[PDB]
Amino acid sequence: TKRLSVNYVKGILQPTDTCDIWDKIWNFQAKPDDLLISTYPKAGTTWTQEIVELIQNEGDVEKSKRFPFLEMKISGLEQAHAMPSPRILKTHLPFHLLPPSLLEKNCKIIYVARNPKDNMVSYYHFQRMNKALPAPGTWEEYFETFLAGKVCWGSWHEHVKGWWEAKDKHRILYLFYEDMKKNPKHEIQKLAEFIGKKLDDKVLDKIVHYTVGDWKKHFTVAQNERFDEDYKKKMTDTRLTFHF
């Protein structure tokens, strides 16, 4: 499949059909009970959405009863527009580019961050499959492209940091993909509680049943030391912190 056009919009690479609708995305109309799931690409968006659906129903069979990406257009705006409330919305936007209605209405946002080395590997494969995304080049090229943030939705570093800095003054639950992998029950309960559910010592277990390090096989040691030196320079407010 031939690849589609990708261009800078407000400082980040995006699919050109996204770019073509920027003022529509920006002017997105949120509702107070909207729940937004925000992640860098391949940082757990689908997984988090499933857990959230399940949280909202608790019962696994009535869940086939509702997904739109604010920014996307093959559009996320249209599917959002015609969805009943409470809506579950998705985005890969960096925090400073979030449609302002989402903050004016004080909607609950769940951000999920993933360690950048596994995220780089996943995003590399994603770009290999997805026509709407730029050609990733070889792995060795891609490593440098990602390190520089020359990918859709911008630098991973800017992304996670911007969202982390936001959590103080905006209604954001900041989760780590690795924590969800290690201690799901603990994370599902945090998520439940953020969303307003006082759930059960045993409803958790149903969702826990029903719903890291791999990057080491892909990075050379040289790539790794270069990555870490770069990271140390970009990431200087070390309350923010990842398991690798």
Residue numbers in the entry: 8 to 73, 80 to 87, 92 to 228, 262 to 294
Which lines from the publication concern this structure?
Cytosolic sulfotransferases (SULTs) comprise a family of enzymes that catalyze the transfer of a sulfonate group from 3′-phosphoadenosine 5′-phosphosulfate (PAPS) to an acceptor group of the substrate. In doing so, SULTs modulate the activities of a large array of small endogenous and foreign chemicals, including drugs, toxic compounds, steroid hormones, and neurotransmitters. As expected, all SULTs share the same basic fold: a central four-stranded parallel β-sheet surrounded by α-helices and three loops that are often disordered (dashed lines) in the absence of PAP and/or substrate. The crystal structures of SULT1C3 bound to PAP, apo SULT1C2, a ternary complex of SULT1C2 bound to PAP, and the environmental toxin, pentachlorophenol (PCP), and SULT4A1 were solved at 3.2, 2.0, 1.8, and 2.2 Å, respectively.
In some cases, partial stabilization can be attributed to molecular packing in the crystal, as in, for example, the stabilization of α14 (green) in apo SULT1C2. Helices α4, α5, and αı5, and loops α5-α6 and α15-α16 are ordered only in the ternary complex, but not in the apo SULT1C2 structure. The degree of disorder and the exact conformation of these loops vary considerably across the family, but in general, the presence of ligands (cofactor and/or substrate) is coupled with increased order, namely, the formation of helices α4-α5 (gold), and α14-α15 (green). Thus, SULT1B1 and 1C2 appear to be much more closely related in terms of structure and activity than their global sequences would indicate.
